[PDB]
Write a protein that binds this ligand. Sequence first.
Ligand SMILES: Cc1cccc(Nc2ncnc3c2cnn3C)c1
Ligand SMILES: Cc1cccc(Nc2ncnc3c2cnn3C)c1
Length: 284
Amino acid sequence: MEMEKEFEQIDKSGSWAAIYQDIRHEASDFPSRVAKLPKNKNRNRYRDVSPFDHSRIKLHQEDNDYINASLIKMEEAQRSYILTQGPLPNTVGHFWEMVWEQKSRGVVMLNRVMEKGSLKCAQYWPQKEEKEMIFEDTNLKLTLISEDIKSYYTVRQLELENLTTQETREILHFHYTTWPDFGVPESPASFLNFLFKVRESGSLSPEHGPVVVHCSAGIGRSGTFCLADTCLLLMDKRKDPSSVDIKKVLLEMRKFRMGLIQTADQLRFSYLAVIEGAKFIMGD
Ligand SMILES: Cc1cccc(Nc2ncnc3c2cnn3C)c1
Ligand SMILES: Cc1cccc(Nc2ncnc3c2cnn3C)c1
């Protein structure tokens, strides 16, 4: 079926939970043996969210190459993404090592450091220009260059220096600051505006390594971001945009990381975002 009318048919019939459970039943199951080794227990935030072995990102290190991060490679859309958990106190150096080694231009953050009164990820970037951060375990230096605070999101320019080679690179930090502690946003308008700002920066384009995107576990809000982006790109590329099937795209992405889209409310929000986004692209 088309998307917008499949949407109203699920609303009127109140069957979002059944649709979402079907997706969960059909989703791929691949091994995640490296994630479960005892030496990696303090590298995982949640015991039930792990990268598959076949798609995990490997650190260029001979001691321990593990990070909780996955490469989502979308062949028809010609887009790749790295989805990862929010960094932990003992993995902030690994996080920036990955950014460096994978040649990423941008980092997309969809959570606040504290939500619901608890810490959802480490404070992994500097908050003042004159107070830079050094990660001694991976030999990197990170400096805040500039910050632009807007009503729904903040963009930061960061400098990452490999202290071994003295090479430097500019990284863009796109921080969506207004996702509610509970539920999903009422309108997709600010989330779509944010997605378009990431696109306009070059961070999603083939001349760079894959964008790094995270929330707390790296599957819920993060899944919504890449699902909406890929569906909108396919609607631009194909002769028949109504042929784009969001459930099929989501199942393809779940071949590469488990659990993407965590609730039936997040599934409905993803439909809403793609539907509204397709009107703004055109040709409008
Ligand atoms: C606040 C912020 C966030 C992200 C990127 C940038 N970059 C720039 N922002 C404004 N003017 C700029 C540049 C680079 N060159 N020039 C001339 C700034
Ligand atoms: C926030 C951000 C990140 C990355 C790229 C950009 N690009 C620009 N955004 C706005 N005006 C711009 C440019 C480049 N030239 N000029 C004149 C902005």
